[PDB]
Amino acid sequence: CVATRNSCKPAAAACCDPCASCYCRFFRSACYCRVLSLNC
């Protein structure tokens, strides 16, 4: 699955990260699983 800051679109298993979240950027079209905790 998606390790980190790779891809969001959680189809079936491409965003494994219970310590992160689906973050988006300016584009807002290519979101990825980014850890917005900085604690894990």
Features:
Agouti-signaling protein, 40 residues, mainly beta, flat, Agouti Related Protein, Chain A
Number of helices: 0
CATH architecture: Irregular
**Rg, Å, rounded:** 10 Å
Order of helices and strands: EE
Domain Agouti: 1-40
Organism: Homo sapiens (Human)
GO cellular component, one term: extracellular space
Subcellular location: Secreted
Question: Any overview of this molecule?
Answer:
The structure is a monomer. With 40 residues, the chain is mainly beta. A two-stranded antiparallel ribbon has the order 1-2. Strand 1 and strand 2 form a beta hairpin. The chain starts with 20 loop residues before the first strand and ends in a 6-residue tail after the last strand.
In short:
This protein has no helices and two strands.
Topology:
Layout: E1 21-23, E2 32-34
Antiparallel strand pairs: 1-2
Disulfide bonds: 1-16, 8-22, 15-33, 19-40, 24-31
Subcellular location: Secreted
Protein name: Agouti-signaling protein
